[PDB]
């Protein structure tokens, strides 16, 4: 039943990832955001070191 906890899980996932991606790209120049585009966006989503 915890599956149906959030009733709009699609929107929740999209908004959370969009927010964190935008916040992390906010700290880098356009040159950096295009050199390591996928790299920084993928570390933006789940930023950690493992």
């Amino acid at each position: 039943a915890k599956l149906f906890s959030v009733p709009d899980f699609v929107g929740d996932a999209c908004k959370a990832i969009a927010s964190r991606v935008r916040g992390a790209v906010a700290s880098v120049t356009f040159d950096d955001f295009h050199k390591n585009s996928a790299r920084i966006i993928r570390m933006a989503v789940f930023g950690f070191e493992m």
Binding site: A1, F4, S5, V6, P7
Partner: protein, 51 residues
């Protein structure tokens, strides 16, 4: 009968004024109001920015 079909991740609060008792049921239950049971109508903020 007045019966409200509560959503799954939702809660509806009622009181039996005839019986002097309070009960709120969360989850997806079908409430059945006693003849003096009344609902908790909630005015909530909406709109594009907010209202």
């Amino acid at each position: 009968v007045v019966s409200y079909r509560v959503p799954h991740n939702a809660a509806v609060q009622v009181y039996d004024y005839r019986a002097k008792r309070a009960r709120v049921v969360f989850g997806p239950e079908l409430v059945t109001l006693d003849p003096e049971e009344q609902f908790t109508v909630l005015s909530l903020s909406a709109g594009r920015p907010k209202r």
